[PDB]
Design a binder for this molecule. Structure first.
Ligand SMILES: *[C@@H]1O[C@H](CO)[C@@H](O[C@@H]2O[C@H](CO)[C@@H](O[C@@H]3O[C@H](CO)[C@@H](O)[C@H](O[C@H]4O[C@H](CO)[C@@H](O)[C@H](O)[C@@H]4O)[C@@H]3O)[C@H](O)[C@H]2NC(C)=O)[C@H](O)[C@H]1NC(C)=O
Ligand SMILES: *[C@@H]1O[C@H](CO)[C@@H](O[C@@H]2O[C@H](CO)[C@@H](O[C@@H]3O[C@H](CO)[C@@H](O)[C@H](O)[C@@H]3O)[C@H](O)[C@H]2NC(C)=O)[C@H](O)[C@H]1NC(C)=O
Ligand SMILES: *[C@@H]1O[C@H](CO)[C@@H](O[C@@H]2O[C@H](CO)[C@@H](O)[C@H](O)[C@H]2NC(C)=O)[C@H](O)[C@H]1NC(C)=O
Ligand SMILES: *[C@@H]1O[C@H](CO)[C@@H](O[C@@H]2O[C@H](CO)[C@@H](O)[C@H](O)[C@H]2NC(C)=O)[C@H](O)[C@H]1NC(C)=O
Ligand SMILES: *[C@@H]1O[C@H](CO)[C@@H](O)[C@H](O)[C@H]1NC(C)=O
Ligand SMILES: *[C@@H]1O[C@H](CO)[C@@H](O)[C@H](O)[C@H]1NC(C)=O
Length: 203
């Protein structure tokens, strides 16, 4: 569980909020909003309206950035988004972590979220609980403009200026929530504190 960002719950705030998760359209199997919505249990309209997308049915581009609505809850001082998912042929907790859910979750947390189920083999159409990293804003963050801490998987050769510009987030606010140089969080989930849902650049 190497990730230089603490997803621990808030002491100041409520323990159950509504926030967003940053998803990237993926190469073979995740180029439509309907396909991405199938693993988050919601309509592709909500994803389109959150990602600031005009055409809901418009095919997506690899590494196109989306925003997925999510309900963040606190479980054992740690906060996750409990998401139900039906097992398909060839699925396992590990592969789901690094492909379908693109490193917005751990195999370890995925496993601990389903302690009585098996990670490697599991029958078809059996439902599992995918835990996605998220966090509710501290009351000190709620005092200022901050209303969402958006979960974002730090990509390779990303930087603070680039990320904060896409989301319209304050860098100092961003680094206060993470407190690291982002030198060891590649393909790991970090937090973008925004004041409002950003208008993304879309084709
Ligand atoms: C989530 O984060 C994980 C890191 O924890 C990240 O894992 C990476 O996945 C890719 C793809 O599965 C791995 O890339 C492979 O690297 C090996 C050597 O390390 C290569 O041999 C592979 O080469 C090719 O193999 C095929 C031919 O046999 C080709 O047809 C194919 O196109 C491959 O290019 C391949 O490059 C990478 O090693 C891991 N890295 C780690 C540290 O595990 C994963 O990509 C992240 N997921 C997302 C969605 O971002
Ligand atoms: C959304 O996701 C689904 C599944 O995750 C994707 O379905 C896949 O679609 C391709 C073609 O688009 C299928 O390939 C086909 O294989 C059959 C043989 O089974 C062949 O006869 C066809 O000519 C074609 O090559 C693939 O099987 C299918 N996968 C599954 C599991 O059904 C779909 O493409 C995704 N769509 C988007 C927009 O991302
Ligand atoms: C994640 O959510 C699922 C439901 O969406 C939880 O499972 C349910 O738990 C209640 C509590 O008694 C049961 O009545 C339901 O039958 C369960 N549904 C199932 C198992 O599909 C699950 O407990 C949640 N996980 C965590 C870690 O909070
Ligand atoms: C983060 O994930 C990316 C894949 O999205 C990894 O990039 C791949 O790395 C392997 C090994 O060098 C190459 O064979 C692939 O061609 C790379 N994919 C590209 C360039 O699109 C990257 O290595 C991962 N980084 C970490 C730290 O895990
Ligand atoms: C969590 O906060 C503490 C306080 O310094 C420290 O362990 C670290 O900065 C954070 N954790 C990680 C994995 O960065
Ligand atoms: C973004 O930051 C990385 C280092 O984290 C750097 O290598 C890259 O050149 C930067 N890109 C831009 C456009 O400044």
């Amino acid at each position: 569980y190497i990730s230089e960002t603490n997803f621990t719950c808030p002491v100041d705030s409520p323990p159950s909020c509504e926030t967003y998760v940053a998803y990237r359209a993926q190469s073979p199997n995740f180029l439509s909003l309907s396909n991405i919505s199938d693993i988050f249990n919601l309509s592709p309209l909500r994803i389109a309206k959150a990602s600031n997308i005009e055409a809901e049915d418009k095919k997506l581009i690899p590494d196109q950035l989306l925003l997925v609505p999510v309900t963040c809850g606190c479980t054992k001082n740690h906060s996750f988004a409990n998401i139900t998912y039906s097992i398909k042929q060839g699925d396992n907790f590990f592969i789901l972590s690094i492909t379908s859910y693109q490193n917005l979750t751990n195999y370890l947390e995925f496993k601990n979220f389903n302690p009585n189920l098996s990670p490697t083999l599991l029958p078809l159409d059996t439902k599992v609980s995918v835990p996605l990293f998220c966090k509710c804003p501290s009351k000190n963050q709620l005092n200022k403009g901050i209303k969402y801490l958006i979960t974002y998987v730090w990509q390779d050769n990303d930087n603070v200026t680039l990320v904060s510009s896409k989301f319209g987030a304050s860098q100092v606010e961003m680094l206060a929530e993470n407190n690291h140089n982002f030198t060891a969080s590649t393909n790991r989930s970090v937090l973008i504190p925004v004041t409002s849902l950003p208008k993304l650049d879309q084709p």
